[PDB]
Design a protein around this nucleic acid. Sequence first.
DNA 1: TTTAAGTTTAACTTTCAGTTTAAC
DNA 2: GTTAAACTGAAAGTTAAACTTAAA
Lengths: 93, 93
Amino acid sequence: FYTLNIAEIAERIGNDDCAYQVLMAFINENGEAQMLNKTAVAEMIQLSKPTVFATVNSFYCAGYIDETRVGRSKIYTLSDLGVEIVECFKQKA
Amino acid sequence: FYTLNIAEIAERIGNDDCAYQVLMAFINENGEAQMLNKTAVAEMIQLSKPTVFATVNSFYCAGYIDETRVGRSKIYTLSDLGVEIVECFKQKA
DNA sequence: TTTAAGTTTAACTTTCAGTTTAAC
DNA sequence: GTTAAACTGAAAGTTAAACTTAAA
């Protein structure tokens, strides 16, 4: 339905500390994408649960992270869109 | 760069109270899209500033709302993408 | 004087595991 | 005698409000 420029998105995220760290949390010590529950993310970055959780929620809405039911809770991984956004940043650095 | 299905997004937002109300806040009494600062939104919906603000920020990242500098602060309006998402909901109702 | 936004703390609503007791 | 359920002991998460810092 709608075409998306991945460079603008990455540009926007880069200008917003919380979005940026929420995104990068899913990338591990060896550069590999990983699974995380909401609590892990909030613990990993130094921002409050409300901030981090709301960001996680919106990023799943945006389709940047995936949600999958696991136990009676949920886990988050970067979507293919998520991984592509992360790539723009890696190239900068 | 990336194609987007507007129905899935709307589906995701509809399953998340905060995202949904943050989005609809921009639609006024007469059905018209309107401008809002971050404070207006948080005051309008009954959720905490941290939740609402983080959601606003991520929605601008996603390209659902636009940011424009005004005074030395910012204001938010739905993008064309934002308006299209709102339309799916209007059709449901 | 009404200034706005963000962060932290407190309160309220919907925590998990182990042990003991009761019922089949 | 074994299994299941409930209660108690060692509760967690989210949202809202208030205060402080950067104030117009």
